[PDB]
Design a protein around this ligand. Structure first.
Ligand SMILES: C=C(C)[C@@H]1CCC(C)=C[C@H]1c1c(O)cc(CCCCC)cc1O
Ligand SMILES: C=C(C)[C@@H]1CCC(C)=C[C@H]1c1c(O)cc(CCCCC)cc1O
Lengths: 354, 143, 354, 354, 354, 143, 143, 143
């Protein structure tokens, strides 16, 4: 009941906060609901579909609002689970976080609207869509990748901007009079942009052959330099995700290392023959012929924990095995130094024994 | 020897409640929760598999007393303990501060009581330095 | 005859099932036939080409159906080779597999149609085209790559969707009245989609300068984030193919390792001087001065197998050689530990001999 | 004052020359100013916005020119800090550099214009935008990447050009008469270019079905080969930036190595017991019971410097750790050779002692 | 003269055949000449530029033909240099190679045309442009990359083709009646192709909202899968070029290894004290106090060659250093095994000496 | 020795049917298929080449006696056998279970009869553990 | 010993101006500026921390005597000095030219005066070659 | 010794034609083309530099006698020759066939006449195998 109450509070907090399994399914379902709300809004904007679209949108939005309200209430009521925030004071303290500010502002705006509204609805929908992240993971990853490849991205921007400016100016000069698409340099800049990005609307295109040749010569280089950032960002995304996975692997290594050291010390301090080991026997007594059984379970725990840790020492990378084996190489250096010292002792004794 | 054989017989009787000579995973679970620790079915299964040698899902007496007589020097855990402490040595100095031991020993894996870390430091700070050389510690557990 | 019958059945089953060499050529030819059928259907849809296109399509489709029927019958009749499925019962059991269900459904639909049909023909053609894979290799590879890069792909989708929504809304605001292309937010969303993908049909484009400026400022980022997935998927495809090749290399290593161990034991147990070796001599007797000839054969086989295995231990990778050499490094650890023990014995004797 | 004068000159030169922190902020602000000037010029080209755009442009350009003048004067006056250029003669010698030639030519052209001018203004703005780099870092990086991947880029150009020529010619043949878009081979070449680059203006497109099929078959391959250079350049940019970062890491390693060797020698030559060490004591005296305090200072500096160098030996790469550990492996080879020599001595003595 | 004649023949053959330095400049100039010929032909196709374009084209083409003929004659006359082809018979034998067949066919076609011609001129221009390669390097590289990434490319083709077919069919169904762009499935297929490739001509686009929704939903995935091959090919090109560079590095290693072994044997066999070394002294005598001078020459050559080879053993890669160090690791295994044998001898003597 | 030389002469006569002193690939093929094993022409070519040292496509008597006297200590197969068993040691424990040996021995490479695996375990299970230390097995094969 | 303890007491009194038994970072700053070298607050803090063992921000007498008695052989700087000289050995020959030492010693890190490099070469050019084998230098410094 | 010192006097007189005690690159070039081999100016420059120790562009007599007395055991060319032969050991067997030596010795680097390869195999084919163990070759060349 009470213990079950706290257990359920913690479990639901885990579901709402960092999810792993089925909590991800629930988050996907609520994401699908909000995405359907946005799609229904877009449909309602269509004139021929306005009636039924809005009719369904009203009910789907009331469902969305009740779901959001119950989610926020459960968040506040489960905020006491963590040791950081406990009780009503702790929950209110947690509610002060900026993300909770965003959630509550969206909630109050939505309830005010429900109880020219199209633009406010659009803004609120965009805000909740942004709210879907709940961790800034996407934004943090994008920022990290941009910062990591800042030099390449800035070089691409500089080269592409110079190419765009020069190509637009040259085509404008080559098509100032003949073509009415390029009556002003701003039109030429718009053309250069929609060409170097390969969008090519077709509203403005060169028609004079000098303009066509200049456009070709510059658009080759321009499209190359404008497509550069996509590849740069893809490589950066992959690299950063791999780095995060490596860090997670190393933490998953850290935990079984503690397990192994714990079990090894327990096994060594539960030896039957040795004395002054009450510091370990007292632990088993508090948890509770029995001595030998305790020793057996302890040594078997050590075996299983050593197996777990050894499996946890997967290479996962070239650098990882290189470091692990370099530890052993330093151990070899120490051992061979010891052998050198012993052989020095032997050669010193040689004259003595002769 | 014979006296240790009798001690292992008493231990097996404590484990093998059914008395059939084979320890069942359920019997191991019962004795564990009697000891105050709650293991999981898959955890206990992998546990016995690690201690199992005949691939039967249980243990006969010879495997049990072989494990009981199985000294850790034979186990060859020098490298494993070395790697664990190196993992917990964020600097690579070849040692580890006492406060880091206090934090880690009672926060990850199977958290140990303050008494356990007290005996750990007792048998670790042989020189009374606090920055125990983990290599020396594993060497001492081996010897 | 009978043994030849089973051999031919196995060979043809291998041809239909996993092919390596010329069976791939046969599969390519049948794929070309079905692709020509699809192309002829598409041509038949063209009005000015309908007569001759349909005339050739009828005969090419009858050829396709007879080829498909003979292939399916040969598959069923050759399904008995594998130990999993033998005899009529085994063949019928194999026919229950979902892929055989798809093939038989396509066959019956085609024969019913031949013996508003254009849409059914189109559906059947797409179904057989999908059927061409026969192993889901492409689909499995795509799914594995998508799952592996789930975070990067989802981040790209989230950021690109937010960019599309915001750009479409801003351009809609900037061109609500002046431009008739953006009379509704749905039209603006369509424009944003066909721009950020760089398709740029040209049916809708901004014309107001505020709209043009917003479109540029947003389309740069949007095209970057919309082109991200292509690079991500390319990298994933390459990585997964390399991983599969590495696994295949390791299996090709596994087999000659068994060969080497087999030959080594055979040659060690064929030694002339050693006794209690009839357990190996009986095998050679069953296969059938002969003793020395058999030993020569055995040592020769050991030599060739050792050569094969050693060649099979190609590096192929940094990690592979790192692991192979780490094995030897552990061996060095053991040997130097033994030398340390022996030197400890020597230093213990030192006081004794003095 | 005077020393403060030289210190301020050097600091402001560092801000103006290679920047690290807030000097980058100042450079970003001046870049934003010049970019706003360019944007205002582009706006002034727009007819409906000409009045206010030009009105703001005049004042923003006078601000830009005063900022540029003060920056150039401060550059000339701070050019004396470096040992290469000192005094008025040194500053005038530095002003001869080609980049300063570009800056001064831009300045004089701008002041002449201020005190058909639209084209001159555009040229001057482009020139200063190019001038923003101040180090050719972007141009050097692009040239290095192009040279490094010269073979791949040239192969892509050759294949893509052949594909463009062949596709344009074939579509021209297939659409010579039916379609007025392809009345000349030059028009077909323009179409092939704007297709293979995926710009697709829509001014020219095949309409005959033979032309459409040829365009499809060739445009697949053509778009692949035309999009190749973007990926090639992205990979090259990433690789070159990583190489530069590695070199910077190795220099950051080089400096603490000197620190460590310096401190080690100082600590070894400041030993209390040893004599003939006045060469080290004199340094600490000219910098100025005291002797032991100096020894403590020296050994303590050695400890901190050793820590700095050790943390400076970060792997940063697989090759780096491989080289560092190969040094130790060669050391191990030497040590084991020494042990072999000593064991040879022992085995030589064995017969003698027997 | 005669020796100079053969030297010049070899030098010019190297210029025409595999060039390294300034022969590349000559090849670039002739490439520029032929490219100008092609550009002038394309210009001549333009009606308003026909007169002057053709006038310049005639003279530029006569220059091109004279240069081409003299180059071909010099190739034939310099083909006698190589040991494979010597004399008139050797030159005629070499002229049989398929590339010379292409060259001679182009020459005869050009001379026949010069001494409906526009189409033949275009074909000849394309043929000579293809001829510019002279080694198939680009074609070989592209084929190698395609074969290496066959699985990824085929998977991309399969998935993209299925996506194109399905999207075109669905849009055709959604726009069969409302839109006249999609009156036939072939038209819808053309739209789907020019959409998924992101060419987006704009001649055909969906207008019904069901069609627009389907087009968006499918074009996202379709453009991803259609842009996949560009990245795949870029990665393959980079990998293959790196592999070729590695092989070239290993050959540049192979040659100085022979140099080092040669010099080492010469220095070991030029020792003054050792006898039976006339086999090396005769070499120096035939090349021609002198003995010691020759030995000094030999040791100096050994030093310089050892330096050259050691510098030639650059890392260049992780695998390269791993292999080089694994050689030493095996050597260490052998040395430690020898030490183990010696220690076994010592422990056997232990009981004996006691 | 001399008697071993006579035995090798009898063996060579058995192989070199023509008696010309050179073993032809066809002679080796016929003796193989007489033994009951069918080799391929390329396989036999690689075979003879692995023995062939004079580059003649055949083997003279000195090479035959060299292969006969070639003890596997000289061959230096310790590393190769170690690597093979490591390949088949899916865990890296330094040993291998008996059941895995039974499965692989008679299902991979040149499948061996049950008698061969029986003698394998007989000369391998010296400690009667089943989890034979493959390193010890190769060491005893070498010794 | 006792006399060295008294010398260290004099040194501590010179350092610990306050006389409270704890050397403050500010006291270290004053003594450094008296010595003619100006350190930074963060530099001095990390410096004492590398010297600090009790985590107090200062140093007690036992730590001062520990660092005074801390012979560099215990420090194990062989590998570090080896790596530094290898870093400055642009060729990898195992040595380094005298001119490179003249340039580097007086231009990098804490630039040393000509006298320091003179004594460096004096105790380094034992063979009078100039191309000092830095392995020998580190070995003698250790010895 | 003194007699070898006078022999080196004669050698230097042969090299140092000018007699100033400094060997000029032009003197080395003329003596080389007298010997029948034509070096390049940069090649001879790198030559002297590798032998040059005083950084003067020439060689004083002490350096010449150092190079004369410089035995190849000091040079430590074991690893270099090992790597060269491994480069030419396309199989990694630890040996190399005689025919490959005949081809390589007279086709790459500085091609050697048939006499040189004949003496090479004479002093290398100690066991008359042809598949010379290049490890043994470098070891004997060192010994
Ligand atoms: C400086 C860049 C970006 C490279 C390198 C220099 C040159 C010759 C062209 C660029 C480039 C293209 O811009 C486009 C292609 C595709 C084929 C174009 C058909 C003419 C290849 C191609 O290398
Ligand atoms: C020589 C290149 C560049 C490859 C390999 C050969 C072939 C089959 C096609 C090229 C290619 C495309 O040009 C386009 C796609 C995307 C799907 C196209 C839908 C029909 C895949 C695809 O492999």
């Amino acid at each position: 009941r009470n213990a079950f109450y706290r257990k359920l509070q913690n479990f639901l907090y885990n579901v709402l906060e960092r999810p792993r399994g089925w909590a991800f399914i629930y988050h996907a379902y609520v994401f699908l609901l909000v995405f359907s709300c946005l799609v229904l809004s877009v449909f309602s904007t269509i004139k021929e579909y306005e009636k039924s679209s809005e009719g369904a949108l009203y009910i789907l939005e009331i469902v969305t609002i009740v779901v959001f309200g119950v989610e926020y209430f459960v968040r506040i009521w489960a905020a006491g689970c963590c040791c950081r925030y406990r009780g009503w004071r702790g929950r209110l303290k947690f509610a002060r976080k900026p993300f909770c500010v965003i959630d509550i502002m969206v909630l109050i705006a939505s309830i005010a609207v429900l109880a020219s509204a199209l633009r406010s609805l659009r803004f609120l929908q965009i805000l909740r869509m942004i709210r879907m992240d709940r961790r800034g993971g996407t934004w943090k990853l994008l920022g990290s990748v941009v910062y990591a490849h800042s030099k390449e991205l800035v070089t691409a921007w500089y080269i592409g901007f110079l190419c765009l400016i020069l190509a637009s100016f040259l085509v404008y000069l080559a098509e100032k009079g003949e073509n009415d698409h390029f009556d002003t340099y701003a039109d030429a800049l718009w053309w250069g942009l929609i060409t170097l990005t390969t969008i090519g609307y077709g509203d403005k295109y060169p028609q004079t052959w000098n303009g066509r040749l200049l456009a070709a010569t510059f658009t080759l280089i321009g499209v190359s330099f404008f497509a550069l950032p996509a590849g740069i960002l893809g490589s950066g995304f992959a690299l950063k995700v791999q780095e995060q996975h490596r860090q997670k692997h190393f933490e998953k290594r850290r935990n079984p290392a503690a397990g192994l050291i714990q079990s090894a010390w327990r096994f060594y301090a539960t030896n039957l023959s040795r004395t002054d080991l009450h510091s370990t026997w007292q632990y088993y007594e508090r948890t509770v012929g029995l001595k030998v059984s305790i020793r057996a379970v302890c040594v078997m725990r050590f075996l299983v924990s050593k197996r777990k840790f050894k499996e946890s020492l997967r290479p996962y990378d070239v650098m990882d095995v290189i470091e692990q084996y370099s530890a052993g190489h330093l151990d070899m250096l120490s051992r061979i130094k010891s052998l050198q010292s012993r052989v020095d002792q032997i050669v010193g004794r040689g004259p003595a024994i002769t | 020897t014979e006296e240790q054989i009798a001690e292992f017989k008493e231990a097996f009787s404590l484990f093998d409640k059914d008395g059939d000579g084979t320890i069942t995973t359920k019997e191991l679970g019962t004795v564990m929760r009697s000891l105050g620790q709650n293991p999981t079915e898959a955890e206990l299964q992998d546990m016995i598999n690690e201690v199992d040698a005949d691939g039967n899902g249980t243990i006969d007496f010879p495997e049990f007393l072989t494990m009981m007589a199985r000294k850790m020097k034979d186990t060859d855990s020098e490298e494993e303990i070395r790697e664990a402490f190196r993992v917990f040595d964020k600097d690579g100095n070849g040692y580890i501060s006492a406060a880091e031991l206090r934090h880690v020993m009672t926060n990850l894996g199977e958290k140990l009581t303050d008494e356990e870390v007290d005996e750990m430091i007792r048998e670790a700070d042989i020189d009374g330095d606090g920055q125990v050389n983990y290599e020396e510690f594993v060497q001492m557990m081996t010897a």
